[PDB]
Protein backbone atom coordinates (compact mmCIF):
# COMPACT_ATOMS: atom_id res chain seq x y z
CA UNK A 1 0.00 0.00 0.00
CA UNK A 2 1.29 3.45 -1.02
CA UNK A 3 -1.25 5.89 0.48
CA UNK A 4 -0.96 9.42 -0.86
CA UNK A 5 -2.10 10.64 2.56
CA UNK A 6 1.24 9.69 4.12
CA UNK A 7 3.16 11.05 1.13
CA UNK A 8 1.37 14.33 1.81
CA UNK A 9 2.35 14.15 5.48
CA UNK A 10 5.97 13.87 4.36
CA UNK A 11 5.68 17.03 2.25
CA UNK A 12 3.92 18.98 4.99
CA UNK A 13 6.38 17.74 7.62
CA UNK A 14 9.44 19.22 5.87
CA UNK A 15 8.02 22.68 5.13
CA UNK A 16 25.50 36.95 -4.26
CA UNK A 17 22.53 34.94 -5.57
CA UNK A 18 24.72 31.91 -6.31
CA UNK A 19 26.08 31.77 -2.76
CA UNK A 20 22.57 32.07 -1.31
CA UNK A 21 21.36 29.29 -3.62
CA UNK A 22 24.12 26.95 -2.45
CA UNK A 23 23.39 27.73 1.20
CA UNK A 24 19.72 26.83 0.74
CA UNK A 25 20.62 23.66 -1.18
CA UNK A 26 22.96 22.49 1.58
CA UNK A 27 20.33 23.30 4.21
CA UNK A 28 17.65 21.28 2.39
CA UNK A 29 19.84 18.19 1.94
CA UNK A 30 19.51 17.56 5.68
CA UNK A 31 15.75 18.09 5.38
CA UNK A 32 15.65 15.84 2.30
CA UNK A 33 16.90 12.92 4.41
CA UNK A 34 14.06 13.43 6.89
CA UNK A 35 11.55 13.65 4.04
CA UNK A 36 12.70 10.39 2.46
CA UNK A 37 12.33 8.60 5.81
CA UNK A 38 8.64 9.56 5.81
CA UNK A 39 8.01 8.10 2.34
CA UNK A 40 6.43 4.66 2.91
CA UNK A 41 8.85 1.71 2.61
CA UNK A 42 11.95 3.83 1.86
CA UNK A 43 13.51 3.21 5.28
CA UNK A 44 12.85 -0.51 4.74
CA UNK A 45 15.25 -0.57 1.78
CA UNK A 46 18.89 -1.59 2.27
CA UNK A 47 20.97 1.27 3.64
CA UNK A 48 23.23 1.21 0.58
CA UNK A 49 20.21 1.52 -1.72
CA UNK A 50 18.81 4.40 0.34
CA UNK A 51 22.16 6.15 -0.14
CA UNK A 52 22.16 5.42 -3.88
CA UNK A 53 18.62 6.76 -4.34
CA UNK A 54 19.28 10.01 -2.48
CA UNK A 55 22.66 10.65 -4.11
CA UNK A 56 21.01 10.06 -7.50
CA UNK A 57 17.93 12.23 -6.99
CA UNK A 58 18.80 14.79 -4.33
CA UNK A 59 19.16 17.51 -6.96
CA UNK A 60 15.90 16.90 -8.83
CA UNK A 61 14.21 16.45 -5.44
CA UNK A 62 15.30 19.88 -4.21
CA UNK A 63 14.58 21.59 -7.53
CA UNK A 64 11.03 20.21 -7.53
CA UNK A 65 10.59 21.55 -3.99
CA UNK A 66 11.62 25.17 -4.47
CA UNK A 67 9.86 25.33 -7.84
CA UNK A 68 6.45 24.39 -6.42
CA UNK A 69 7.21 26.63 -3.44
CA UNK A 70 7.58 29.55 -5.88
CA UNK A 71 4.35 29.16 -7.88
CA UNK A 72 2.98 32.23 -6.09
CA UNK A 73 6.17 34.23 -6.73
CA UNK A 74 6.33 36.61 -9.70
CA UNK A 75 9.34 35.86 -11.94
CA UNK A 76 11.34 34.62 -8.97
CA UNK A 77 12.36 31.73 -6.76
CA UNK A 78 11.68 31.36 -3.03
CA UNK A 79 14.69 29.71 -1.43
CA UNK A 80 14.31 27.49 1.63
CA UNK A 81 16.29 30.13 3.54
CA UNK A 82 13.46 32.64 3.07
CA UNK A 83 15.29 34.72 0.45
CA UNK A 84 13.52 35.67 -2.78
CA UNK A 85 15.74 35.40 -5.86
CA UNK A 86 14.31 37.38 -8.77
CA UNK A 87 15.13 36.49 -12.37
CA UNK A 88 16.92 39.83 -12.76
CA UNK A 89 19.22 39.04 -9.83
CA UNK A 90 19.84 35.56 -11.24
CA UNK A 91 20.58 37.02 -14.67
CA UNK A 92 22.93 39.58 -13.12
CA UNK A 93 24.76 36.65 -11.48
CA UNK A 94 25.38 34.83 -14.77
CA UNK A 95 22.89 32.00 -14.19
CA UNK A 96 19.96 33.54 -16.03
CA UNK A 97 19.58 30.78 -18.63
CA UNK A 98 18.99 27.89 -16.22
CA UNK A 99 17.03 30.17 -13.89
CA UNK A 100 14.70 31.02 -16.78
CA UNK A 101 14.33 27.32 -17.62
CA UNK A 102 13.16 26.68 -14.05
CA UNK A 103 10.54 29.42 -14.33
CA UNK A 104 9.15 28.54 -17.76
CA UNK A 105 9.42 24.75 -17.58
CA UNK A 106 8.69 24.16 -13.87
CA UNK A 107 7.31 27.01 -11.75
CA UNK A 108 4.97 28.41 -14.40
CA UNK A 109 3.79 24.96 -15.48
CA UNK A 110 3.06 24.12 -11.84
CA UNK A 111 1.22 27.42 -11.36
CA UNK A 112 -0.88 27.08 -14.52
CA UNK A 113 -2.22 23.65 -13.54
CA UNK A 114 -2.39 24.38 -9.78
CA UNK A 115 -0.31 21.33 -8.91
CA UNK A 116 -1.20 20.50 -5.31
CA UNK A 117 1.21 19.31 -2.63
CA UNK A 118 -0.06 15.72 -2.83
CA UNK A 119 0.87 15.52 -6.51
CA UNK A 120 4.23 17.18 -5.86
CA UNK A 121 4.97 14.62 -3.15
CA UNK A 122 4.03 11.78 -5.49
CA UNK A 123 6.32 13.14 -8.19
CA UNK A 124 9.17 13.56 -5.71
CA UNK A 125 8.57 9.99 -4.53
CA UNK A 126 8.64 8.81 -8.16
CA UNK A 127 12.04 10.42 -8.74
CA UNK A 128 13.14 9.08 -5.35
CA UNK A 129 12.25 5.53 -6.40
CA UNK A 130 14.46 5.63 -9.49
CA UNK A 131 15.01 1.99 -10.55
CA UNK A 132 17.65 3.19 -13.04
CA UNK A 133 20.00 4.23 -10.21
CA UNK A 134 23.30 2.43 -10.68
CA UNK A 135 24.40 0.05 -7.93
CA UNK A 136 20.96 -0.79 -6.51
CA UNK A 137 21.09 -4.19 -4.83
CA UNK A 138 17.52 -4.84 -6.02
CA UNK A 139 16.27 -2.45 -8.70
CA UNK A 140 13.06 -4.47 -9.14
CA UNK A 141 12.04 -3.68 -5.56
CA UNK A 142 12.56 0.03 -6.23
CA UNK A 143 10.58 -0.18 -9.47
CA UNK A 144 7.75 -1.90 -7.60
CA UNK A 145 7.72 1.02 -5.16
CA UNK A 146 7.66 3.51 -8.04
CA UNK A 147 4.76 1.65 -9.66
CA UNK A 148 2.75 1.89 -6.43
CA UNK A 149 3.46 5.64 -6.31
CA UNK A 150 2.14 6.54 -9.75
CA UNK A 151 -0.62 3.98 -9.24
CA UNK A 152 -1.89 5.93 -6.22
CA UNK A 153 -1.25 9.26 -7.97
CA UNK A 154 -3.41 8.37 -10.98
CA UNK A 155 -6.29 7.31 -8.72
CA UNK A 156 -5.88 10.53 -6.72
CA UNK A 157 -5.95 12.68 -9.86
CA UNK A 158 -8.99 10.89 -11.30
CA UNK A 159 -10.82 11.38 -7.98
CA UNK A 160 -9.66 14.87 -7.01
CA UNK A 161 -9.76 16.33 -10.55
CA UNK A 162 -12.21 14.03 -12.36
CA UNK A 163 -12.78 16.68 -15.05
CA UNK A 164 -9.05 16.71 -15.99
CA UNK A 165 -8.46 13.22 -17.43
CA UNK A 166 -5.04 14.20 -18.80
CA UNK A 167 -3.76 15.66 -15.53
CA UNK A 168 -2.00 12.41 -14.60
CA UNK A 169 -0.04 12.24 -17.85
CA UNK A 170 0.65 15.98 -17.61
CA UNK A 171 2.24 15.49 -14.18
CA UNK A 172 4.59 12.74 -15.36
CA UNK A 173 5.53 14.74 -18.47
CA UNK A 174 7.26 17.38 -16.32
CA UNK A 175 9.86 14.82 -15.14
CA UNK A 176 11.86 15.01 -18.40
CA UNK A 177 12.21 18.76 -17.88
CA UNK A 178 13.12 18.10 -14.25
CA UNK A 179 15.78 15.61 -15.36
CA UNK A 180 17.51 17.97 -17.80
CA UNK A 181 17.28 20.97 -15.46
CA UNK A 182 18.86 18.94 -12.66
CA UNK A 183 21.79 17.94 -14.86
CA UNK A 184 22.36 21.57 -15.88
CA UNK A 185 22.11 22.83 -12.30
CA UNK A 186 24.63 20.16 -11.31
CA UNK A 187 27.09 21.39 -13.95
CA UNK A 188 26.84 24.87 -12.44
CA UNK A 189 27.55 23.33 -9.03
CA UNK A 190 30.75 21.75 -10.37
CA UNK A 191 31.82 25.01 -12.01
CA UNK A 192 31.19 26.82 -8.72
CA UNK A 193 33.36 24.27 -6.92
CA UNK A 194 36.01 24.21 -9.64
CA UNK A 195 36.24 28.01 -9.76
CA UNK A 196 36.59 27.93 -5.97
CA UNK A 197 34.88 31.33 -5.74
CA UNK A 198 31.69 30.02 -4.12
CA UNK A 199 31.39 28.56 -0.59
CA UNK A 200 30.25 24.93 -0.79
CA UNK A 201 29.20 23.50 2.57
CA UNK A 202 29.85 19.99 3.85
CA UNK A 203 26.69 18.13 2.83
CA UNK A 204 26.51 19.78 -0.60
CA UNK A 205 30.22 19.05 -1.04
CA UNK A 206 29.57 15.39 -0.22
CA UNK A 207 27.04 15.22 -3.06
CA UNK A 208 29.62 16.69 -5.47
CA UNK A 209 32.05 13.88 -4.62
CA UNK A 210 32.18 10.59 -6.49
CA UNK A 211 30.84 7.21 -5.25
Amino acid sequence: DMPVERILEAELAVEDPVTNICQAADKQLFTLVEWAKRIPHFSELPLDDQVILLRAGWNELLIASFSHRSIAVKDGILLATGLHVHRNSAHSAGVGAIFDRVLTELVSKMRDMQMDKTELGCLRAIVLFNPDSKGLSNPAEVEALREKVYASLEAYCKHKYPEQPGRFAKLLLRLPALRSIGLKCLEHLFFFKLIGDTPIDTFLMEMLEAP
Binding site: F30, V33, K37, L47, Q50, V51, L54, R55, T202, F203, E206
Partner: peptide, 9 residues
Amino acid sequence: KILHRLLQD
Protein backbone atom coordinates in the same frame (compact mmCIF):
# COMPACT_ATOMS: atom_id res chain seq x y z
CA LYS B 1 29.47 9.84 4.99
CA ILE B 2 27.25 12.62 6.30
CA LEU B 3 24.36 10.96 4.46
CA HIS B 4 25.07 7.65 6.22
CA ARG B 5 25.07 9.30 9.65
CA LEU B 6 21.75 11.01 8.91
CA LEU B 7 20.13 7.86 7.51
CA GLN B 8 20.96 6.00 10.75
CA ASP B 9 19.41 8.42 13.27
